[PDB]
Symmetry: C3
Subunit: 117 residues, 3 copies
């Protein structure tokens, strides 16, 4: 999985080691081995979420197979909201997630694509 | 809508409050309520646009329903170019936009997905 | 083409002028004129790749026509891995790429969309 988190929290208000805890949480939630989970955090950005520049965060989650239905994503969303609200000290109205299915021919890994591994 | 703006302008050359003005402009252009508009600005990046590292900006716009045709996007592009050229003091050859349709099952909101709200 | 590179290398460990060399490399690899190539580098991020927070980089490549098959992307991946491993002093296990086909109606250019140019 590929997780990307943009926030207007400054880096010094994003708890140390968030990327590592998010990586482990994602592995558990999405049912994927932790050595296949990728996390990118981009703090200190200028953001409006739902029209408001109060602290907020946007999460993007991309994966093969497991983020392509409403019913799967409803479950995933609940868990990721729980994780981020606590970590970032945000209410649920200050987080949004976007889910993006991927296919193996899209993933370049060790100089080839996942199709051939 | 979800707008993401990457620029090689340093943060101190991106006018204060851009994210708020872009949020209001997007609401007007895309015909969506301002409390559904999201904007993320990432300044100070290293960028080449059309082969050149002169100041520039890349905008991504994602939304349900309204960014999926050439004729819709032609109109949207004109307006967003007008907005950004003035705000960022850029010529039109230094901005590019990418439009991405989204579906409700992709949007995690308040711990569920938009499908169920 | 639109290339986006996220890294946890600090900006002062990303060689000067990387964005320019990546732009020229991409033009050669993807067979596109260099004045149509776009590169964005976002350094100093907090990242885990394959579960690990050691230095790493994620590259996204978006283009019309040339990134939509496994066999095309296998070739592209080899070249981009070669480029980035050397530039960033990373092993191949510390880089991942994602390929995203685009269509002309998605690209806002000079106030219109590529469809009409």
């Amino acid at each position: 999985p590929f997780l990307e988190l943009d926030t207007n929290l400054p880096a010094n208000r994003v708890p140390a080691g968030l990327e590592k805890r998010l990586c482990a949480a994602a592995a558990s939630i999405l049912g994927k081995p932790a050595d296949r989970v990728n996390v990118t955090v981009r703090p200190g950005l200028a953001m409006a979420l739902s029209g408001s520049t109060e602290p907020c965060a946007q999460l993007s989650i991309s994966s093969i197979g497991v983020v392509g239905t409403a019913e799967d994503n409803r479950s995933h969303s609940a868990h990721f909201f729980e994780f981020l609200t606590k970590e970032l000290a945000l209410g649920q109205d200050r987080i949004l997630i976007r889910f993006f299915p991927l296919e193996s021919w899209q993933i370049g890994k060790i100089g080839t694509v996942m199709t051939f591994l």
